[PDB]
Amino acid sequence: FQWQRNIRKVR
């Protein structure tokens, strides 16, 4: 999982 600094734009 390549997460860009906490995504938080979907769920």
Amino acid at 3: W
3-state DSSP helix/strand/coil % of the chain, to nearest 5: 0, 0, 100
Question: 2-11 burial by CB neighbour count: b if 16+ within 10 A, else e?
Answer: eeeeeeeeee
What letter represents residue 11's amino acid?
A: R
DSSP alpha helices (H): ranges in 1-11? none
Structure-solving method: NMR
